[PDB]
Amino acid sequence: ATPSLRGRLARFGNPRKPVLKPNKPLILANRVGERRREKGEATCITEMSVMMACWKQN
């Protein structure tokens, strides 16, 4: 669906307390977020440990 927005913000008609307190108006922007690059992680740590273990034995 989308969660309701009826009687959720502090407005004059609204008798109850605000449920939501948005920092920025809940209004769609005309852009979308930039694709964030995936953080890198060390690679081939398993194969490295296999190699480093043989070194210690030999």
Partner: protein, 122 residues
């Protein structure tokens, strides 16, 4: 008013369950209860291990006591079941059939809320 006693017993043999059930039904009567019916839900395995009266229980017989009693009889019967060592767990609730379910009209999907912000150019 009408109540229900959700009675988990100690998975005993017929003489002992019959003995235990008779105790409970009399103790209700002794406190002014009009016992309406007794139901056997069967001996199941407990959803989880219940420790009661210095024993670890894994199975138990499930029973229901439909009865009418004065409102003051509830506290007294609750305390009575505390001291019965053949009851694994006993809870008294308002009878679920006393409440009449209101007719429902249907799910009405929520329209998107409007006029939350002024129509000014930001």
């Amino acid at each position: 008013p009408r109540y229900e006693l959700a009675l988990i017993l100690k998975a005993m043999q017929r003489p002992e369950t019959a003995a235990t059930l008779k105790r409970t039904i009399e103790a209700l009567m002794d406190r002014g209860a009009i016992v309406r019916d007794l139901e056997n839900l069967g001996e199941r395995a407990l959803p989880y291990r219940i420790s009661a009266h210095s024993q670890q229980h894994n199975r138990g017989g499930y029973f229901l006591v439909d009865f009418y009693a004065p409102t003051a009889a509830v506290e007294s019967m609750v305390e009575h079941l505390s001291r019965d060592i053949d009851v694994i767990r006993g809870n008294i609730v308002k009878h679920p059939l006393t409440q009449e379910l209101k007719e429902c009209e249907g799910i009405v999907p929520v329209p998107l809320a409007e006029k939350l912000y002024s129509t000014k150019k930001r």
